[PDB]
Amino acid sequence: KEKGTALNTKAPFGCQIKTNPVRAMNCAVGNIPVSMNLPDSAFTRIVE
Amino acid sequence: APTIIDLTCTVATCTHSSDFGGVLTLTYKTDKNGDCSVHSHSNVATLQE
Secondary structure: OOOOOOHHHOOHHHOEEEOOOOEEEOOOOOOOOOOOOOOHHHOOOOOO | OOOOEEEEEEEEEEOOOOOOOEEEEEEEEOOOOOOOOOOOOOOOOOOOO
C-alpha cells in the first residue's frame, strides 16, 4: 500500500522496465560506437 | 572521322591508386557518331581506354 511510485513510471530517458529477466528497454542515452570491417564484394567498383 | 569542337574536360573523381582509380568526363560537340583516339600527352596520367 505504501510502495511509492514504481520505477516503471519514473525511469528517466524513457526506459520501460520489464521484469522476468529484469531489464530496462528502449533507453535513450549516449552514443553507440560501431566499428565495421567490410568485404570488397560489399562495395561497387568505380567503373560500374 | 568525327570532328570534335569545344572540348572541355572536368574530373569526376581522382584517387591515385595503382589501378585506374581516376575518372574524368569529356564534354564536346561532335558532328557524327564514331570512334577515335584518346590519349593523355603527359605521363602524369595514363588512360585505360
